[PDB]
RNA sequence: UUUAAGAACGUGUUUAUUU
RNA sequence: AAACUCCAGUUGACACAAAAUAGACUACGAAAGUGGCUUUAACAUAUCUGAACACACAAUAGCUAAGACCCAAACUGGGAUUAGAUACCCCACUAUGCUUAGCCCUAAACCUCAACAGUUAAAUCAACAAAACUGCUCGCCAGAACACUACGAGCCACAGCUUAAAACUCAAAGGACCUGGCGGUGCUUCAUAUCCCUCUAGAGGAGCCUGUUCUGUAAUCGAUAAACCCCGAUCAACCUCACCACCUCUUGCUCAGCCUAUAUACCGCCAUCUUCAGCAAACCCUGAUGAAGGCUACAAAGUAAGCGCAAGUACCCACGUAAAGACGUUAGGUCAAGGUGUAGCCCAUGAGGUGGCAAGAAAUGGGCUACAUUUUCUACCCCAGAAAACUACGAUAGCCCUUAUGAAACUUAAGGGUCGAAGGUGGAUUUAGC
């Protein structure tokens, strides 16, 4: 337990220690934000522990100590709330207010938004909640929206909705560059297993590819490997129109092709339309393949295989 | 009290008994008001009222309960199943359903007179009704139709021979 | 079951310290190292002699300050120096602490042939992380 | 188990 | 559940309390653990419906008699008044009767609260002079 | 797998994206709009958008590979296609005027038809009933019978009866026989059909 | 209503300032 | 399978046998018992209880005598199953089940709840069952077993029924419940490399390497169903080393020592269920204050610290793999890592030196290499040329030689030469993998 007087004494130690920490580092105590405290505590008390919640921290007591409910009865002993003896005066005072607004409507007559999660509702109510209790409250809110809710009602419902940052699965085009001669090209990078490739694709060419200074058909004797190099250009009907100059390092025979295929495709996205770039994405030409070799375990012959098991 | 360790079971039972307390009425603060005879499940307890100085002649468990209540003198005989938990649940049951002298007068609106051999024929008024005293007497009954106990009748007739009754024991 | 450096749960009446409450799989995630030197770094030498010195120091100080250590030691090496940092209790008299600081600092300097310094931090009672 | 036989 | 809103409003208007929701075990007998050791339990409980939703006596009727709290109850023809201190035999189903009970208890309580403020003011005024 | 359940399999079809919007149905149009949001797996090296890609021949090659040696398995596949091609040209030049109109020289058309002539219609399942096993006829799914045809062709060639005979010449000989509804692989299919007819009364032993 | 399907030695497992 | 095949099916003729539906009715009779149709006769007592001194009845089975015979059927025979099958399954047939005349007189003859009268309030009430009691009367029972037995007596009963003890023996037997476990226990939903089916490569066959078991030797110990078997050992030519033989020392490298007994005295570090999700302090309540138990969300007594899971962190993320994984279970492993309780040795169960054993008739686990043509050799590191069945494919084996390490090598390793064996894809069975 931490009282209100105790918290008030912690607020005074942070303010004083916040002025000392600026005197150490030579900063202005006035314009000393919390971002500068975290940077100065990491220089003076360097900890490389992987868990960031186990490193030295000097924050504001309102962010360290958990929020605690105020006292619910006075000296005489009478509680301050009429729903006290329920044990959930905050949860039921909310359900009573919502159900009272649904009676008024009957009388006188989303992409970014997401319903508040359970763990985020307890903080608002400072109450411990079950799962089935969370669902009941969500059912009234949805029922409130269907009805012709007034302006004041919308503001209430928006206290229990949280915005969502919708990511965009749209490839990032590379900036087209120009060489000394004036030819346009675009550079990208690919990675397959341990192979890493840098590809330079010229805007105009006669379908020539050179890997590490060697023509592609000599560097890749196997037909399968050359098929991979052809896949990006064939899909967009651009065979015999560009000149590629790449450099692949590491990996093996087939891993270097997939690494080159990916770089050529990424750099080929600058000389094509957006609709084609989306098609290349839906075909698996712009995605880095995460399948890498798995480690062997002790007590096993391989990553997943086991030693021969004898029952008797 | 129930628990895995014996020291933890003593606390639960002790601290939980004060919240289930009875109040037992006593005649002159040394014994009960009348003879009690009940049966809790299979366990029979037949307590009797006795005068001062008789002492406690009852089951060792009842001796320990009575001292807690404050009953100095009373006789009790346990029969049937001697189970410490039914013996206790029945003892507290009969000691709470006993009718005092004041309730009896109020019930019948008559004087409760005490007759003692030591005080001769003197009638001692122990309780009188608070309300209107009835003017008519109780109809005298030629023969009462009250169920008797062969154990008590066999003793009054000098027929209950036992080499274990009326033994010299320590003070209780 | 695994047992190394684990304090088995109990009814809830057993106090434990922070270091004593975390197992070996937390040594670089929620704990640090009680000894800090260069022996165990790549290309470095004399990791075996620095270990025998540590084992002896933790026992010398446990029997030199009997019943006074509140938590494990923290050995630190900066070149030739050897810094012993200890958390001790406040039962013993300061007169006797100053005696043992000078007796140990001196005895260990002549044994290991290095300047040795001892840093005490008194606490009223053994700090408790939680109760198991 | 049942005793061994000779 | 039909009259849960009406009752919660009455308690708020008359500065009193209400418990119309699911009654968790130990709200009275084990209160100090749920709320706190210095909690103050009710001195009077008023049952507008002595039954639960499965047509059985409310657990509070028995838990109140354990904690020595007097109970007032509106018992219908299918209820048990044995443990209710001041029972009131009357209909507990129709809405036209529930509004009456609430209106009567809301008034009797509001009067007494104001009746004491007049008695105290007189004593305080008379006491000084 | 290192992919999450959110990742979706890619569509290498090249003529699907080219479809005009006017042809897109209400349901199909919705599908295309959805894929923009979803994540996509990386296309594997096996399949490309080429015009000569044959999924049936890529699967048969994978069933012949041994120890991850795809360069050698694919080498044997093309040699067989070339050997089947040369044998038909030799039979086409030495044929009569009207016999050359019924001689197929495309090895792919021969490979697909040979495997289709080996697919069994029904199979057998050992059902344990009364401490005994029974060969109960069962309708095989479309995939099962396609896999059995491949496995039987590869198993017959791998037989030891053939001595110092290379796989491309063995497989090519079987494909022609099957293409003509001859050879042992077909007999293996007929034997399965003859054992299911004798055990036809045991069909009731099946519950599914 | 739907095959068969045996056997497993004897004891021991809970209190009180220089000068 | 046997049996039948003067069998089967349709139709017609055709009972001394047995009595669908109605019956979801609940009646008759003292009980036993009685369910097709009709007719005759007929179902005691104007208070109750009342015969184990009598009388009359009493399912089925069974005895005696004479008849009938569709079907069923003990017994028996045959077929099958099984380690055996005097049984369960199939076929056939007999006593018997039916009628008539007599006997026999038993039953879980149990609705295990006596007859007549009456009550529903009080203490309703051990538990379970089919709620708890009063009055009156008769009958019956007094620890278990010996014993529905022996003797005696009675009976149309003769291997019988009825009535019915004792000696020796035991300290329990018995009735009803809580919890858990188990079930060749039911219903439903599932398993995802997992149970079945289904996919891929293997093991079990040969040779070699290596461990173990047996045997052998003067010559370690330990692990040794799952959860041992290239395990303690990321390691034994001397050393290591604790074993054997021989010899030697005695306050002994140690303010001694012991790889001596006890892992069924333990710490320490672990295996296992765990490829689980539960453990549980402290309070409350239910069961009449019993062992115990504690949920229904349109909510019916549960609230719960803490541990674990989860969450976090590590590796290339949000995935996956690691790590983690409680309380307990197997007195599971280890006194030979070290430490240590109890016990034991102290001219020896301690210490040191020299030398030496660690093998194979035999069986088996694991692995390696192969039996070849998707192969073998060379170049190359993927557009080649040759080889291809008694000079092929195929030993890391044997033999010989050389070298490396070391004080020490028929012994360890490496290489060369020589040698060219089994083996022709492997029985029942069996392992791993998304
Ligand atoms: K019965
Ligand atoms: K094999
Ligand atoms: K083998
Ligand atoms: K093997
Ligand atoms: Mg592998
Ligand atoms: Mg583990
Ligand atoms: Mg009502
Ligand atoms: Mg036997
Ligand atoms: Mg047994
Ligand atoms: Mg009579
Ligand atoms: Mg009789
Ligand atoms: Mg009879
Ligand atoms: Mg007969
Ligand atoms: Mg017959
Ligand atoms: Mg037979
Ligand atoms: Mg017959
Ligand atoms: Mg019969
Ligand atoms: Mg009967
Ligand atoms: Mg009877
Ligand atoms: Mg009678
Ligand atoms: Mg007896
Ligand atoms: Mg009998
Ligand atoms: Mg007899
Ligand atoms: Mg006789
Ligand atoms: Mg051994
Ligand atoms: Mg052993
Ligand atoms: Mg052992
Ligand atoms: Mg192993
Ligand atoms: Mg040796
Ligand atoms: Mg030696
Ligand atoms: Mg020794
Ligand atoms: Mg032993
Ligand atoms: Mg053990
Ligand atoms: Mg793990
Ligand atoms: Mg976890
Ligand atoms: Mg053991
Ligand atoms: Mg050769
Ligand atoms: Mg050799
Ligand atoms: Mg040499």
């Amino acid at each position: 337990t931490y009282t209100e007087d105790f918290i008030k004494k912690q607020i005074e130690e942070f303010n004083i220690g916040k002025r000392h920490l600026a005197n150490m580092m030579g900063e202005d105590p006035e314009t000393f934000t919390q971002e500068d405290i975290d940077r100065a505590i990491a220089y003076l008390f360097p900890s490389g522990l992987f868990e960031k919640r186990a490193r030295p921290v000097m924050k504001h007591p309102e962010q360290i100590f958990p929020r605690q409910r105020a006292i619910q009865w006075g000296e005489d002993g009478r509680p301050f709330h009429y729903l006290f003896y329920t044990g959930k005066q905050s949860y039921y005072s909310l359900m009573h207010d919502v159900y009272g607004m649904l009676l008024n409507l009957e009388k006188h007559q989303v992409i970014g938004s997401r319903w508040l999660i359970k763990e985020e509702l307890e903080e608002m109510l400072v109450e411990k909640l079950s799962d089935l209790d969370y669902m009941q409250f969500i059912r009234l809110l949805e029922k409130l929206l269907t009805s012709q809710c007034g302006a004041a009602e919308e503001e209430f419902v928006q206290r229990f909705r949280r915005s969502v940052t919708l990511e965009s699965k749209k490839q990032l085009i590379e900036p087209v560059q120009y060489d000394e001669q004036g030819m346009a090209f675009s550079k990208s990078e690919g990675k397959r297993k341990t192979a890493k490739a840098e590809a330079i694709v010229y805007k105009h060419g006669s379908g020539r590819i050179k890997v590490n200074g060697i023509d592609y058909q000599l560097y890749f004797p196997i037909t399968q490997d050359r098929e991979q190099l052809m896949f990006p250009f064939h899909f967009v009907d651009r065979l015999g129109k560009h000149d590629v100059t790449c450099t692949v390092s590491g990996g093996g025979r087939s891993a270097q092709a997939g690494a080159i295929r990916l770089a050529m495709a990424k750099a080929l996205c600058s000389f094509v339309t957006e609709d084609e770039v989306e098609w290349m994405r839906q075909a698996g030409l712009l995605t880095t393949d995460p399948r890498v070799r798995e480690r062997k375990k002790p007590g096993q012959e391989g990553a997943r295989r086991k030693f021969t098991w004898k029952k008797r | 009290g129930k628990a895995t360790d014996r020291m933890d079971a003593f606390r639960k039972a002790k601290n939980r008994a004060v919240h289930h307390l009875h109040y037992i009425e006593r005649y002159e603060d040394h014994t009960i008001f009348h003879d009690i005879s009940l049966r809790f499940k299979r366990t029979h307890i037949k307590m009797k009222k006795q005068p001062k100085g008789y002492g406690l002649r009852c089951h060792r468990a009842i001796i320990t309960i009575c001292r807690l209540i404050g009953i100095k003198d009373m006789y009790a005989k346990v029969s049937g199943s001697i189970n410490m938990l039914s013996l206790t649940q029945g003892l507290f049951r009969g000691l709470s359903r006993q009718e005092t002298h004041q309730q009896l007068a109020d019930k019948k609106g008559l004087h409760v007179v005490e007759i003692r051999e030591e005080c001769g024929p003197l009638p001692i008024v122990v309780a009188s009704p608070r309300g209107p005293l009835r003017k008519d007497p109780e109809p005298e009954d030629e023969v009462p139709d009250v169920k008797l106990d062969w154990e008590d009748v066999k003793t009054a007739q000098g027929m209950k021979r036992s080499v274990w009754s009326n033994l010299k024991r320590a003070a209780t | 079951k695994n047992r190394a450096a684990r304090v088995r749960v109990s009814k809830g009446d057993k106090p434990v310290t922070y270091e004593e409450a975390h197992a070996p799989h937390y040594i670089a995630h929620r704990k640090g190292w009680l000894s800090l030197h260069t022996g165990n770094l790549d290309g470095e030498d004399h990791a075996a002699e620095r270990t025998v010195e540590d084992v002896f120091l933790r026992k010398f100080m446990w029997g030199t300050f009997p019943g006074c250590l509140a938590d494990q030691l923290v050995l630190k090496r900066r070149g030739n120096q050897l810094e012993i940092c200890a958390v001790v209790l406040r039962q013993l008299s300061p007169h006797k602490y100053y005696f043992l600081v000078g007796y140990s600092e001196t005895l260990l300097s002549y044994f290991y042939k290095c300047p040795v310094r001892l840093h005490l931090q008194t606490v009223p009672s053994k700090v408790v992380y939680k109760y198991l | 188990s049942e005793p061994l036989r000779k | 559940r039909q009259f849960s809103y009406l009752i919660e409003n009455m308690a708020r208007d008359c500065g009193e309390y209400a418990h119309t929701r699911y009654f968790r075990g130990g709200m009275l007998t084990n209160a100090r653990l749920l709320f706190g050791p210095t909690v103050r339990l009710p001195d009077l409980i008023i049952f507008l419906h002595t039954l639960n939703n499965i047509f059985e006596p409310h657990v509070a009727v028995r838990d109140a008699a354990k904690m020595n709290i007097p109970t007032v109850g509106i018992v219908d023809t299918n209820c048990n008044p044995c443990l209710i201190t001041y029972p009131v035999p009357g209909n507990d189903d129709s809405p036209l009767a529930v509004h009456l009970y609430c209106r009567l208890f809301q008034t009797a309580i509001t009067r007494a609260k104001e009746k004491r403020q007049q008695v105290e003011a007189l004593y305080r005024l008379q006491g000084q002079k | 797998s290192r992919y999450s359940p959110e990742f979706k399999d890619p569509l290498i079809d090249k003529e699907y994206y080219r479809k005009p919007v006017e042809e897109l149905t209400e349901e199909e149009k919705y599908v295309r709009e959805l894929k923009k949001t979803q994540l996509i797996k990386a296309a594997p090296a096996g399949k490309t958008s080429s015009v000569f890609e044959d999924p049936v021949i890529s699967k048969f090659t994978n069933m012949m590979m041994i120890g991850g040696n795809k360069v050698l398995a694919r080498s044997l596949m093309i040699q067989t296609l070339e050997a089947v091609k040369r044998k038909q040209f030799e039979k086409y030049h030495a044929a009569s005027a009207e016999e050359q109109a019924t001689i197929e020289r495309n090895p792919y058309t021969i490979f697909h038809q040979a495997l289709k002539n080996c697919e069994p219609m029904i199979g057998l399942v050992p059902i344990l009933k009364g401490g005994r096993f029974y060969q109960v006829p069962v309708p095989l799914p479309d995939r099962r019978r396609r896999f059995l045809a491949m496995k039987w062709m590869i198993t017959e060639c791998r037989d030891k009866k053939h001595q110092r005979t290379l796989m491309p010449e063995k497989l090519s000989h079987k494909l022609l026989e099957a293409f003509h509804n001859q050879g042992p692989v077909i007999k293996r299919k007929h034997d399965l059909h003859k054992m299911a007819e004798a055990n036809r009364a045991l069909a009731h032993y099946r519950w599914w």
Side-chain angles (χ1 to χ4, degrees), chain A residues 307-308:
Chain A
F307 290 136
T308 298

PDB file of all heavy atoms in Angstrom, chain A residues 307-308, chain H residues 228-231 366, ligand 28:
ATOM      1  N   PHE A 307      16.920 -39.127 -31.824  1.00  0.00           N
ATOM      2  CA  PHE A 307      17.635 -40.390 -31.775  1.00  0.00           C
ATOM      3  C   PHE A 307      16.652 -41.556 -31.792  1.00  0.00           C
ATOM      4  O   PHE A 307      15.485 -41.429 -31.411  1.00  0.00           O
ATOM      5  CB  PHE A 307      18.511 -40.472 -30.524  1.00  0.00           C
ATOM      6  CG  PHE A 307      19.700 -39.557 -30.545  1.00  0.00           C
ATOM      7  CD1 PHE A 307      20.037 -38.818 -29.427  1.00  0.00           C
ATOM      8  CD2 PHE A 307      20.487 -39.441 -31.674  1.00  0.00           C
ATOM      9  CE1 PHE A 307      21.131 -37.979 -29.439  1.00  0.00           C
ATOM     10  CE2 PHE A 307      21.581 -38.605 -31.689  1.00  0.00           C
ATOM     11  CZ  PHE A 307      21.901 -37.874 -30.571  1.00  0.00           C
ATOM     12  N   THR A 308      17.140 -42.706 -32.248  1.00  0.00           N
ATOM     13  CA  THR A 308      16.314 -43.903 -32.281  1.00  0.00           C
ATOM     14  C   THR A 308      15.835 -44.246 -30.877  1.00  0.00           C
ATOM     15  O   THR A 308      16.628 -44.315 -29.934  1.00  0.00           O
ATOM     16  CB  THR A 308      17.100 -45.070 -32.874  1.00  0.00           C
ATOM     17  OG1 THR A 308      17.466 -44.762 -34.225  1.00  0.00           O
ATOM     18  CG2 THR A 308      16.269 -46.335 -32.865  1.00  0.00           C
TER      19      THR A 308
ATOM     20  P     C H 228      17.273 -43.169 -18.716  1.00  0.00           P
ATOM     21  OP1   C H 228      18.178 -43.608 -17.626  1.00  0.00           O
ATOM     22  OP2   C H 228      17.356 -41.778 -19.219  1.00  0.00           O
ATOM     23  O5'   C H 228      17.504 -44.144 -19.954  1.00  0.00           O
ATOM     24  C5'   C H 228      17.555 -45.551 -19.773  1.00  0.00           C
ATOM     25  C4'   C H 228      18.965 -46.048 -19.577  1.00  0.00           C
ATOM     26  O4'   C H 228      18.936 -47.339 -18.915  1.00  0.00           O
ATOM     27  C3'   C H 228      19.773 -46.297 -20.842  1.00  0.00           C
ATOM     28  O3'   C H 228      20.352 -45.122 -21.381  1.00  0.00           O
ATOM     29  C2'   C H 228      20.802 -47.319 -20.381  1.00  0.00           C
ATOM     30  O2'   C H 228      21.872 -46.695 -19.688  1.00  0.00           O
ATOM     31  C1'   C H 228      19.988 -48.149 -19.390  1.00  0.00           C
ATOM     32  N1    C H 228      19.413 -49.361 -20.015  1.00  0.00           N
ATOM     33  C2    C H 228      20.255 -50.439 -20.286  1.00  0.00           C
ATOM     34  O2    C H 228      21.456 -50.347 -20.000  1.00  0.00           O
ATOM     35  N3    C H 228      19.746 -51.553 -20.853  1.00  0.00           N
ATOM     36  C4    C H 228      18.449 -51.612 -21.146  1.00  0.00           C
ATOM     37  N4    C H 228      17.983 -52.727 -21.705  1.00  0.00           N
ATOM     38  C5    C H 228      17.567 -50.530 -20.879  1.00  0.00           C
ATOM     39  C6    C H 228      18.085 -49.435 -20.317  1.00  0.00           C
ATOM     40  P     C H 229      20.737 -45.048 -22.940  1.00  0.00           P
ATOM     41  OP1   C H 229      21.649 -43.894 -23.125  1.00  0.00           O
ATOM     42  OP2   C H 229      19.486 -45.129 -23.733  1.00  0.00           O
ATOM     43  O5'   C H 229      21.581 -46.373 -23.204  1.00  0.00           O
ATOM     44  C5'   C H 229      22.939 -46.461 -22.803  1.00  0.00           C
ATOM     45  C4'   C H 229      23.568 -47.767 -23.215  1.00  0.00           C
ATOM     46  O4'   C H 229      22.772 -48.870 -22.715  1.00  0.00           O
ATOM     47  C3'   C H 229      23.666 -48.023 -24.713  1.00  0.00           C
ATOM     48  O3'   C H 229      24.798 -47.402 -25.300  1.00  0.00           O
ATOM     49  C2'   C H 229      23.705 -49.544 -24.795  1.00  0.00           C
ATOM     50  O2'   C H 229      25.017 -50.035 -24.566  1.00  0.00           O
ATOM     51  C1'   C H 229      22.809 -49.947 -23.623  1.00  0.00           C
ATOM     52  N1    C H 229      21.425 -50.262 -24.041  1.00  0.00           N
ATOM     53  C2    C H 229      21.136 -51.532 -24.538  1.00  0.00           C
ATOM     54  O2    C H 229      22.050 -52.362 -24.625  1.00  0.00           O
ATOM     55  N3    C H 229      19.871 -51.824 -24.916  1.00  0.00           N
ATOM     56  C4    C H 229      18.917 -50.901 -24.806  1.00  0.00           C
ATOM     57  N4    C H 229      17.682 -51.221 -25.186  1.00  0.00           N
ATOM     58  C5    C H 229      19.183 -49.600 -24.298  1.00  0.00           C
ATOM     59  C6    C H 229      20.437 -49.327 -23.929  1.00  0.00           C
ATOM     60  P     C H 230      24.643 -46.487 -26.612  1.00  0.00           P
ATOM     61  OP1   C H 230      24.253 -45.122 -26.184  1.00  0.00           O
ATOM     62  OP2   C H 230      23.792 -47.220 -27.581  1.00  0.00           O
ATOM     63  O5'   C H 230      26.117 -46.414 -27.212  1.00  0.00           O
ATOM     64  C5'   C H 230      27.251 -46.289 -26.360  1.00  0.00           C
ATOM     65  C4'   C H 230      27.898 -44.927 -26.460  1.00  0.00           C
ATOM     66  O4'   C H 230      29.195 -45.041 -27.113  1.00  0.00           O
ATOM     67  C3'   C H 230      27.116 -43.871 -27.247  1.00  0.00           C
ATOM     68  O3'   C H 230      27.228 -42.603 -26.609  1.00  0.00           O
ATOM     69  C2'   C H 230      27.848 -43.832 -28.583  1.00  0.00           C
ATOM     70  O2'   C H 230      27.706 -42.624 -29.296  1.00  0.00           O
ATOM     71  C1'   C H 230      29.283 -44.071 -28.134  1.00  0.00           C
ATOM     72  N1    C H 230      30.200 -44.528 -29.190  1.00  0.00           N
ATOM     73  C2    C H 230      31.550 -44.182 -29.075  1.00  0.00           C
ATOM     74  O2    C H 230      31.925 -43.543 -28.080  1.00  0.00           O
ATOM     75  N3    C H 230      32.421 -44.566 -30.031  1.00  0.00           N
ATOM     76  C4    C H 230      31.986 -45.252 -31.085  1.00  0.00           C
ATOM     77  N4    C H 230      32.876 -45.609 -32.008  1.00  0.00           N
ATOM     78  C5    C H 230      30.620 -45.605 -31.240  1.00  0.00           C
ATOM     79  C6    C H 230      29.770 -45.222 -30.285  1.00  0.00           C
ATOM     80  P     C H 231      25.906 -41.753 -26.289  1.00  0.00           P
ATOM     81  OP1   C H 231      24.871 -42.100 -27.294  1.00  0.00           O
ATOM     82  OP2   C H 231      26.307 -40.338 -26.103  1.00  0.00           O
ATOM     83  O5'   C H 231      25.425 -42.329 -24.887  1.00  0.00           O
ATOM     84  C5'   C H 231      26.367 -42.619 -23.869  1.00  0.00           C
ATOM     85  C4'   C H 231      25.756 -42.475 -22.503  1.00  0.00           C
ATOM     86  O4'   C H 231      25.083 -43.706 -22.132  1.00  0.00           O
ATOM     87  C3'   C H 231      26.728 -42.234 -21.361  1.00  0.00           C
ATOM     88  O3'   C H 231      27.154 -40.886 -21.272  1.00  0.00           O
ATOM     89  C2'   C H 231      25.935 -42.712 -20.156  1.00  0.00           C
ATOM     90  O2'   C H 231      24.976 -41.746 -19.756  1.00  0.00           O
ATOM     91  C1'   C H 231      25.205 -43.917 -20.742  1.00  0.00           C
ATOM     92  N1    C H 231      25.953 -45.172 -20.519  1.00  0.00           N
ATOM     93  C2    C H 231      25.971 -45.709 -19.234  1.00  0.00           C
ATOM     94  O2    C H 231      25.361 -45.117 -18.334  1.00  0.00           O
ATOM     95  N3    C H 231      26.653 -46.849 -19.000  1.00  0.00           N
ATOM     96  C4    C H 231      27.296 -47.449 -19.998  1.00  0.00           C
ATOM     97  N4    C H 231      27.957 -48.572 -19.724  1.00  0.00           N
ATOM     98  C5    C H 231      27.294 -46.925 -21.320  1.00  0.00           C
ATOM     99  C6    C H 231      26.616 -45.794 -21.535  1.00  0.00           C
ATOM    100  P     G H 366      18.644 -50.802 -32.442  1.00  0.00           P
ATOM    101  OP1   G H 366      17.317 -50.201 -32.722  1.00  0.00           O
ATOM    102  OP2   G H 366      19.147 -51.909 -33.290  1.00  0.00           O
ATOM    103  O5'   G H 366      19.729 -49.640 -32.471  1.00  0.00           O
ATOM    104  C5'   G H 366      19.618 -48.522 -31.604  1.00  0.00           C
ATOM    105  C4'   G H 366      20.904 -47.740 -31.545  1.00  0.00           C
ATOM    106  O4'   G H 366      21.933 -48.543 -30.911  1.00  0.00           O
ATOM    107  C3'   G H 366      21.515 -47.355 -32.884  1.00  0.00           C
ATOM    108  O3'   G H 366      20.916 -46.213 -33.468  1.00  0.00           O
ATOM    109  C2'   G H 366      22.981 -47.167 -32.531  1.00  0.00           C
ATOM    110  O2'   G H 366      23.200 -45.913 -31.903  1.00  0.00           O
ATOM    111  C1'   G H 366      23.185 -48.278 -31.506  1.00  0.00           C
ATOM    112  N9    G H 366      23.682 -49.517 -32.130  1.00  0.00           N
ATOM    113  C8    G H 366      22.963 -50.645 -32.423  1.00  0.00           C
ATOM    114  N7    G H 366      23.678 -51.583 -32.978  1.00  0.00           N
ATOM    115  C5    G H 366      24.949 -51.036 -33.058  1.00  0.00           C
ATOM    116  C6    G H 366      26.153 -51.583 -33.567  1.00  0.00           C
ATOM    117  O6    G H 366      26.343 -52.695 -34.070  1.00  0.00           O
ATOM    118  N1    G H 366      27.207 -50.687 -33.451  1.00  0.00           N
ATOM    119  C2    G H 366      27.116 -49.429 -32.915  1.00  0.00           C
ATOM    120  N2    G H 366      28.244 -48.710 -32.891  1.00  0.00           N
ATOM    121  N3    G H 366      26.003 -48.907 -32.436  1.00  0.00           N
ATOM    122  C4    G H 366      24.967 -49.762 -32.539  1.00  0.00           C
TER     123        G H 366
HETATM  124 MG1  LIG I  28      23.035 -43.258 -26.664  1.00  0.00          MG
END
